[PDB]
Protein backbone atom coordinates (compact mmCIF):
# COMPACT_ATOMS: atom_id res chain seq x y z
CA UNK A 1 0.00 0.00 0.00
CA UNK A 2 0.91 3.67 -0.33
CA UNK A 3 -0.32 6.11 2.31
CA UNK A 4 -1.93 9.42 1.39
CA UNK A 5 -1.72 12.29 3.87
CA UNK A 6 -3.21 15.76 3.50
CA UNK A 7 -2.56 19.42 4.22
CA UNK A 8 -5.20 22.14 4.52
CA UNK A 9 -5.22 25.92 4.20
CA UNK A 10 -6.33 27.98 7.21
CA UNK A 11 -8.69 30.92 6.78
CA UNK A 12 -6.80 32.68 9.56
CA UNK A 13 -3.55 33.25 7.65
CA UNK A 14 -3.79 31.47 4.29
CA UNK A 15 -0.91 29.18 5.23
CA UNK A 16 -0.91 25.40 4.78
CA UNK A 17 -0.89 22.94 7.71
CA UNK A 18 -0.67 19.15 8.09
CA UNK A 19 -4.00 17.46 8.77
CA UNK A 20 -4.14 15.05 11.71
CA UNK A 21 -7.77 14.00 11.28
CA UNK A 22 -11.05 14.67 9.48
CA UNK A 23 -13.78 14.93 12.11
CA UNK A 24 -16.98 15.83 10.24
CA UNK A 25 -18.48 16.95 6.93
CA UNK A 26 -21.14 19.40 5.81
CA UNK A 27 -22.86 19.84 2.45
CA UNK A 28 -24.47 22.82 0.74
CA UNK A 29 -27.10 23.17 -1.99
CA UNK A 30 -24.63 25.45 -3.77
CA UNK A 31 -21.84 22.87 -3.75
CA UNK A 32 -18.27 22.86 -2.41
CA UNK A 33 -18.40 20.38 0.52
CA UNK A 34 -16.62 21.33 3.73
CA UNK A 35 -14.71 19.17 6.19
CA UNK A 36 -13.95 19.78 9.87
CA UNK A 37 -10.20 19.52 10.35
CA UNK A 38 -7.94 18.88 13.32
CA UNK A 39 -4.44 20.21 12.61
CA UNK A 40 -1.36 18.09 13.39
CA UNK A 41 0.34 20.86 15.34
CA UNK A 42 -2.70 22.06 17.26
CA UNK A 43 -5.71 21.10 19.37
CA UNK A 44 -9.51 21.24 19.34
CA UNK A 45 -9.59 25.01 19.85
CA UNK A 46 -7.92 25.41 16.45
CA UNK A 47 -10.22 23.03 14.54
CA UNK A 48 -11.51 24.51 11.27
CA UNK A 49 -14.19 24.03 8.62
CA UNK A 50 -12.28 23.76 5.34
CA UNK A 51 -13.34 23.89 1.69
CA UNK A 52 -12.45 20.40 0.45
CA UNK A 53 -11.95 21.20 -3.23
CA UNK A 54 -10.13 24.51 -2.77
CA UNK A 55 -8.21 24.21 0.49
CA UNK A 56 -7.39 20.53 1.04
CA UNK A 57 -4.67 18.77 -0.95
CA UNK A 58 -2.15 15.94 -0.80
CA UNK A 59 0.68 16.80 1.59
CA UNK A 60 3.74 18.63 0.26
CA UNK A 61 7.07 16.84 0.64
CA UNK A 62 10.07 18.16 2.60
CA UNK A 63 12.95 17.65 0.18
CA UNK A 64 15.73 15.10 0.53
CA UNK A 65 19.20 16.53 -0.13
CA UNK A 66 19.40 14.89 -3.56
CA UNK A 67 15.86 15.95 -4.51
CA UNK A 68 16.95 19.53 -5.24
CA UNK A 69 17.06 18.52 -8.90
CA UNK A 70 13.27 18.16 -8.75
CA UNK A 71 12.84 21.82 -7.80
CA UNK A 72 12.60 23.85 -11.00
CA UNK A 73 11.97 27.48 -12.00
CA UNK A 74 8.24 27.86 -12.62
CA UNK A 75 7.24 25.31 -9.99
CA UNK A 76 4.73 25.91 -7.25
CA UNK A 77 6.25 24.84 -3.94
CA UNK A 78 5.28 25.05 -0.29
CA UNK A 79 7.88 27.34 1.24
CA UNK A 80 8.66 28.06 4.89
CA UNK A 81 8.38 31.82 5.37
CA UNK A 82 10.29 32.43 8.60
CA UNK A 83 10.02 35.87 10.18
CA UNK A 84 9.95 37.95 13.35
CA UNK A 85 6.62 37.06 14.90
CA UNK A 86 5.66 34.04 12.78
CA UNK A 87 7.03 31.24 10.62
CA UNK A 88 4.54 29.50 8.33
CA UNK A 89 4.34 27.40 5.16
CA UNK A 90 3.05 29.48 2.22
CA UNK A 91 2.61 28.69 -1.47
CA UNK A 92 5.39 30.18 -3.59
CA UNK A 93 6.76 29.97 -7.12
CA UNK A 94 10.40 29.30 -7.98
CA UNK A 95 11.83 32.14 -10.07
CA UNK A 96 15.41 30.90 -10.25
CA UNK A 97 17.82 28.32 -8.83
CA UNK A 98 21.49 28.70 -7.96
CA UNK A 99 22.75 25.12 -8.02
CA UNK A 100 25.98 24.45 -6.15
CA UNK A 101 28.11 21.39 -5.42
CA UNK A 102 26.91 19.41 -2.40
CA UNK A 103 29.09 18.64 0.61
CA UNK A 104 28.93 16.77 3.93
CA UNK A 105 25.99 18.89 5.05
CA UNK A 106 24.07 18.00 1.91
CA UNK A 107 22.48 20.35 -0.62
CA UNK A 108 24.14 23.75 -1.10
CA UNK A 109 21.69 24.92 -3.78
CA UNK A 110 19.72 28.15 -3.33
CA UNK A 111 16.32 29.16 -4.69
CA UNK A 112 14.85 32.56 -5.44
CA UNK A 113 11.13 32.31 -4.67
CA UNK A 114 8.09 34.56 -4.88
CA UNK A 115 5.28 33.99 -2.37
CA UNK A 116 1.88 33.77 -4.07
CA UNK A 117 -0.10 35.53 -1.35
CA UNK A 118 1.94 38.74 -1.05
CA UNK A 119 4.27 38.75 -4.10
CA UNK A 120 7.22 39.08 -1.71
CA UNK A 121 10.49 37.48 -2.78
CA UNK A 122 13.16 35.59 -0.84
CA UNK A 123 16.28 33.47 -1.33
CA UNK A 124 15.88 30.16 0.49
CA UNK A 125 17.83 26.93 1.10
CA UNK A 126 16.40 23.49 0.25
CA UNK A 127 15.49 22.86 3.90
CA UNK A 128 12.72 25.45 3.63
CA UNK A 129 11.26 23.90 0.48
CA UNK A 130 8.48 21.33 0.23
CA UNK A 131 7.75 19.99 -3.24
CA UNK A 132 4.34 18.88 -4.51
CA UNK A 133 4.01 15.07 -4.56
CA UNK A 134 3.58 14.86 -8.35
CA UNK A 135 7.23 15.89 -8.74
CA UNK A 136 8.03 12.35 -7.59
CA UNK A 137 7.38 11.58 -11.26
CA UNK A 138 10.45 13.62 -12.18
CA UNK A 139 12.57 11.70 -9.68
CA UNK A 140 11.24 8.40 -10.99
CA UNK A 141 12.24 9.42 -14.51
CA UNK A 142 15.74 10.24 -13.28
CA UNK A 143 15.86 6.91 -11.45
CA UNK A 144 15.14 5.14 -14.73
CA UNK A 145 18.20 6.77 -16.30
CA UNK A 146 20.58 4.93 -13.97
CA UNK A 147 22.72 1.87 -14.71
CA UNK A 148 21.11 -1.55 -14.27
Amino acid sequence: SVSVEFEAKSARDGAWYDVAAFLSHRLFESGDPEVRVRFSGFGAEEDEWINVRKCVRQRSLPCEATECVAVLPGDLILCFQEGKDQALYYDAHVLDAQRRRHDVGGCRCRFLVRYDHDSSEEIVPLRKVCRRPETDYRLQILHAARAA
Partner: peptide, 8 residues
Protein backbone atom coordinates in the same frame (compact mmCIF):
# COMPACT_ATOMS: atom_id res chain seq x y z
CA UNK B 1 9.36 13.24 5.97
CA UNK B 2 9.19 15.84 8.73
CA UNK B 3 8.18 19.47 8.20
CA UNK B 4 9.39 22.35 10.36
CA UNK B 5 7.09 23.50 13.16
CA UNK B 6 4.84 26.39 12.15
CA UNK B 7 4.51 29.23 14.62
CA UNK B 8 1.48 31.48 14.40
Amino acid sequence: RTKQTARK
